[PDB]
Design a protein around this nucleic acid. Sequence first.
DNA 1: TAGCACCGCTTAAACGCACGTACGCGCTGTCCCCCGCGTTTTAACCGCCAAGGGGATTACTCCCTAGTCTCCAGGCACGTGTCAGATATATACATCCTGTGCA
Length: 48
Amino acid sequence: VLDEAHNIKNFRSTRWQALLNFNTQRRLLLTGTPLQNNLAELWSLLYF
DNA sequence: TAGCACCGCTTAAACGCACGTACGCGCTGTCCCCCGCGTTTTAACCGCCAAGGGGATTACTCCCTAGTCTCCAGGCACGTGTCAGATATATACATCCTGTGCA
């Protein structure tokens, strides 16, 4: 689980890459109101 | 022609040995500072936010530069002559001996 997924928003960040590499069986992303953000970040999250 | 070898005097630098003394080491007590450790503070990076500047590399294009052969005539190097210095030895008395005439 990731809380406050809005912090993930930048796929260019190193933490985004690290998190993506982490082997997991299921993933849950929790954030208040991501839809506020530009489409690009939404795509990033969906790619995650 | 510069190094090698043997001659063979002349010191003097090495050497053995003697005495002592002041230096190095063993042990002392002291005390202060720098380690082992705990708590606070600072320096640094991630991510924000994505670039523009300007720098090093790369190439083309003359052209100027001194690599080249060559003559001219020299100024620099190899040597001999001259001048000076350090060494050598007479001298004008220096430092004295010694028979003998004088007090």
